[PDB]
Symmetry: C4
Subunit: 90 residues, 4 copies
Amino acid sequence: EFQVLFVLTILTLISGTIFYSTVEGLRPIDALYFSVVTLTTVGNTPPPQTDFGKIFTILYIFIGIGLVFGFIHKLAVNVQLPSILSNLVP
Amino acid sequence: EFQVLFVLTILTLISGTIFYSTVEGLRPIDALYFSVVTLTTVGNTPPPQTDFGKIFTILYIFIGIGLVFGFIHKLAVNVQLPSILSNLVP
Amino acid sequence: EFQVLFVLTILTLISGTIFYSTVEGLRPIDALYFSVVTLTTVGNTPPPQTDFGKIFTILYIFIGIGLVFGFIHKLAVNVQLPSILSNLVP
Amino acid sequence: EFQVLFVLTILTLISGTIFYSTVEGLRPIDALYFSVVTLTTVGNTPPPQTDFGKIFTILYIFIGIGLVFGFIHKLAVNVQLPSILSNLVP
Ligand code: NA
Ligand code: NA
Ligand code: NA
Ligand code: NA
Ligand code: NA
Ligand code: NA
């Protein structure tokens, strides 16, 4: 489960990194950053400048938001929770 | 279900596209982009410039956020999940 | 329930409108808009300029986000759902 | 539970405050504000300027979003709910 969500999230972010670096001309790190804050809805960056970028972003959000949050709802629920919970046992 | 959420989300986005292109003077694609990132809470754009735009946006958010996320919670839960899940079966 | 969430959300937004119009010097409509997009996490505006504004915003988010989304999870779940659901009955 | 989420959220915010004040050169209050609106996804600020800042932010979001919202889902569910609910009893 967690491993699958791990991989699925990775592929989605790889696609975004490749897309934004190419179409929006961003350095890879900036393309990855944009992909991450966009799918997590933080969105603390300017929007894409090209229409291709805007269209892809619309589809990217609808298809990737569900997956990203599913992974987050496990990275802290089935991994970080025990670490803290089980440790709260004297 | 999914088909209904599909249509309901479409109508909501069509209304936003028409509104922002008219009142905020945005090109249709930009009006659609604003509608999408606003309802998904990504919000990586400047805010509306007119008071009419601000008021509509407030109401648009309250009425559309629930629907948009309901659709997302199906586009990946009752469509993308199987595709990946059932495929994880050797 | 819905009526209570309705009122509770109203009071929270009234407080934000009063605060931002006074401390950040915003016109009431802009103060209301900021309060709304902040609590719904859309956040498509610049941040507060004063430290008082930043501190209040931090507390406002933690205390208001839960309520706002609770109301949204009813404005479309116990009001908009039937309207569309029951109507989907030939 | 609530007390644990309280503390866990505090530590996460302390780390962010220390990181952004040092690496992004922000005044402590601004570093705390950035940490808060980033993890709650409000994101109404410009993005980090350094690559170190961008990388940390990516990891910070994935590891902190789950915790922050878990705490919020209690600050209003197991603390603010009763205060209002039990009080709605004539
Ligand atoms: Na959000
Ligand atoms: Na956001
Ligand atoms: Na945002
Ligand atoms: Na934003
Ligand atoms: Na933003
Ligand atoms: Na912004």
